[PDB]
């Protein structure tokens with residue numbers, strides 16, 4: 001209960017209740033609506049109202065005293081004192097923060113916009129003149145990549161925390177938690193309960209370190225114009241109460257985008273309306289002389305794609321009993337049993353029945369651990385085991401148009417990409433930066449406010465090139481390598497088997513960042529870090545020049561496997577284990593096919609180059625190694641390739657210890673990888689060959705799932721040239737994803753600054 005006879009006079013939107021959540025499922029004071037939500041005579045002055053008698057019933061004021069009180073209309077001195085709009089002024093550089101004396105730091109305003117597709121910036125100064133001036137005058141990128149699923153709640157909270165949805169808990173707009181036995185929905189009281197929201201959002205991080213925060217939630221009752229005036233009012237408060245971080249949120253252009261689709265003619269007016277709101281903010285900041293003091297982030301949560309009811313796949317066309325499953329539908333699918341203790345429910349049968357039933361099926365089923373690792377969408381009990389990736393432009397529903405637009409698809413889809421602009425004293429002047437992921441902004445926003453960020457999934461230092469003015473450190477090597485010479489006789493081995501750095505290790509040896517034991521093994525054509533714990537290489541580095549020749553293996557040397565005299569028999573694999581395992585075969589990390597001579601080819605058959613590989617996966621690996629590596633080398637002027645295994649049985653995106661591994665080669669202690677990776681590097685200046693590179697690097701990487709069939713690839717019955725490249729692209733990855741998965745640290749000795757290397761490690765080759 002609260003005594004609502006108490007007033008909100010002189011405390012509207014305070015930091016009885018008068019806060020932004022008091023209309024949600026609480027209760028405001030009796031005069032909240034009268035005092036705080038005044039809408040009389042609009043949000044703009046006229047020549048008629050200039051120097052008028054002050055009326056407290058007005059929404060904003062044009063009287064002579066309004067400036068000292070800090071509640072002028074945003075255009076007051078434009079209309080009444082003959083000043084120009086902020087937009088009409090010439091672009092002047094801010095070489096330092098021009099804040100009133102008393103300010104301890106420049107303020108940050110985060111202007112978030114729902115469903116702002118990246119291609120909307122193409123409209124230009126005709127439709128959005130304020131946003132366009134912010135973009136051209138400040139720091140900007142072509143786009144910003146959201147997280148998966150590309151929905152509002154997961155992305156806005158990712159922006160707040162720097163965390164993947166699996167880690168912060170908001171894995172969807174809709175979700176079920178089986179420990180709570182409760183459902184989160186866009187509509188309802190449940191979403192306000194704190195138990196759903198993990199991590200530490202920017203506003204808590206700020207408050208804990210002595211920095212006051214504005215509201216990061218506005219009620220839908222409060223109009224957009226009031227929100228701006230509230231922020232401007234808070235900026236005029238005294239030094240003890242004045243916040244340093246502020247947020248604005250708009251539900252446009254999302255709401256319109258759903259109705260009319262991203263390229264509808266009706267989209268123009270919503271964009272005009274948003275820019276009108278941005279113009280009020282900049283004009284109001286100019287009135288306060290804070291227009292060269294505040295840092296402003298214009299950011300979206302995701303894009304928008306053409307979707308209609310005609311393009312709906314129905315699960316009832318694939319499964320028999322759709323009345324026994326619950327489906328979270330639309331631009332993604334999540335399937336679970338409707339009733340617990342249902343013996344008729346079979347997950348394998350559901351996945352089999354959804355797998356490659358038509359030539360042109362517009363979704364694909366996955367167990368969540370088999371999803372592309374770049375999505376980081378497994379490690380949460382709120383994410384269901386069965387997942388459907390839906391093809392762009394389509395929906396999935398259970399069984400059988402108001403809307404023309406939707407989103408939520410795979411976060412590398414062009415139409416899901418969104419927007420970023422940074423403008424102010426701490427952002428650079430007229431600078432263009434490469435695309436980046438929204439997980440990185442938490443760290444930047446902490447830097448901008450002088451805060452120590454909480455542990456997050458950004459790579460602190462990767463966005464230093466956005467700011468005019470944090471120094472990142474390279475991690476400490478935990479285990480030093482051994483460099484074994486010849487230590488064992490050929491006759492010491494009973495494995496049942498029968499029969500450099502300047503060229504092949506260009507960017508230093510990788511640093512092992514966990515406690516283990518491993519050997520560096522040199523060869524003519526390749527180098528490797530051989531693990532005596534996991535009985536295979538952690539990594540294998542080799543360089544293929546532009547004009548390198550692919551030979552083949554002679555018929556008699558097909559099953560050649562040789563003991564390596566530098567490694568003990570008891571820390572080596574054996575062929576007998578592979579003969580006994582009916583389901584498992586083996587492959588090589590450096591391919592025999594790319595040997596520089598017949599003599600060197602014998603090094604590639606060493607037991608220390610061998611790795612366990614299902615026959616179905618060898619179809620993928622042989623095509624990658626024999627055909628594609630030469631093709632990449634030809635096209636990129638040679639390539640350096642680093643390949644190795646990944647073990648992630650608990651699908652948490654992090655390198656497994658020994659106890660997490662659930663699958664070994666039959667009757668052995670040879671662990672089976674869940675995935676295989678490659679990091680393919682060359683010169684960005686493609687006129688220089690990869691081994692003699694002067695400038696910036698170019699990188700692409702993948703994390704291929706190590707699966708005993710090719711059920712993911714619908715054309716796998718065809719030749720590898722019809723389906724393998726398509727599989728690899730789907731599983732593209734940042735080098736940083738591989739570092740988490742292996743506890744390795746790559747690119748430790750280059751000619752580039754460490755900040756530029758962290759940008760390189762966060763790059764995703766999207767193929768879009």
Ligand SMILES: *[C@@H]1O[C@H](CO)[C@@H](O[C@@H]2O[C@H](CO)[C@@H](O[C@@H]3O[C@H](CO[C@H]4O[C@H](CO[C@H]5O[C@H](CO)[C@@H](O)[C@H](O)[C@@H]5O)[C@@H](O)[C@H](O[C@H]5O[C@H](CO)[C@@H](O)[C@H](O)[C@@H]5O[C@H]5O[C@H](CO)[C@@H](O)[C@H](O)[C@@H]5O)[C@@H]4O)[C@@H](O)[C@H](O)[C@@H]3O)[C@H](O)[C@H]2NC(C)=O)[C@H](O)[C@H]1NC(C)=O
Nearest residue numbers: 166167168169198199200379380381454455456457653740
């Ligand atoms: C992306 O970055 C993430 C952050 O660096 C990485 O996640 C982190 O991973 C490490 C290693 O696995 C975990 O470390 C273990 O922590 C155990 C204790 O965890 C519990 O306490 C934490 C308390 O934190 C305090 O400070 C934070 C701010 O820093 C405040 O927000 C807290 O309130 C508190 O004051 C807490 O962070 C953690 O939170 C999880 O659990 C709650 C509910 O129980 C969820 O609401 C929340 O979303 C977190 O869930 C996530 O992590 C758990 C595992 O902890 C998963 O099961 C779940 O599915 C979800 O992914 C928790 O309450 C400790 O016993 C161990 O010895 C380790 O030190 C961190 O817990 C974990 N933190 C977070 C926030 O995820 C992530 O690996 C990384 N990913 C990649 C691919 O690189």
Ligand SMILES: CCc1nc2c(C)cc(N3CCN(CC(=O)N4CC(O)C4)CC3)cn2c1N(C)c1nc(-c2ccc(F)cc2)c(C#N)s1
Nearest residue numbers: 110112152153156159160191192197216217218247248249
């Ligand atoms: C889709 C719009 C929206 N609607 C709501 C509602 C109704 C509630 C809501 N809550 C209510 C519950 N609240 C609990 C809370 O205070 N904390 C959980 C942490 O421990 C701190 C978390 C957020 C966020 N909402 C949001 N979100 C996610 C918003 N995000 C932002 C946002 C976040 C980060 C930004 F950088 C910019 C804007 C807003 C603003 N301004 S509003």
Ligand SMILES: *[C@@H]1O[C@H](CO)[C@@H](O)[C@H](O)[C@H]1NC(C)=O
Nearest residue numbers: 318319320321346349350353
């Ligand atoms: C799979 O499809 C077959 C053939 O249409 C059907 O008889 C069977 O019941 C389906 N299984 C499930 C679990 O839906």
Ligand SMILES: [Ca+2]
Nearest residue numbers: 648654655656
């Ligand atoms: Ca793991």
Ligand SMILES: [Cl-]
Nearest residue numbers: 097099105106
């Ligand atoms: Cl300052």
Ligand SMILES: [Cl-]
Nearest residue numbers: 545638690691
């Ligand atoms: Cl080369």
Ligand SMILES: [Cl-]
Nearest residue numbers: 696697752760
């Ligand atoms: Cl570089």
Ligand SMILES: [Mg+2]
Nearest residue numbers: 578581584585
């Ligand atoms: Mg076998």
Ligand SMILES: [Zn+2]
Nearest residue numbers: 114115152301
């Ligand atoms: Zn949204």
Ligand SMILES: [Zn+2]
Nearest residue numbers: 115254258407
């Ligand atoms: Zn939407």
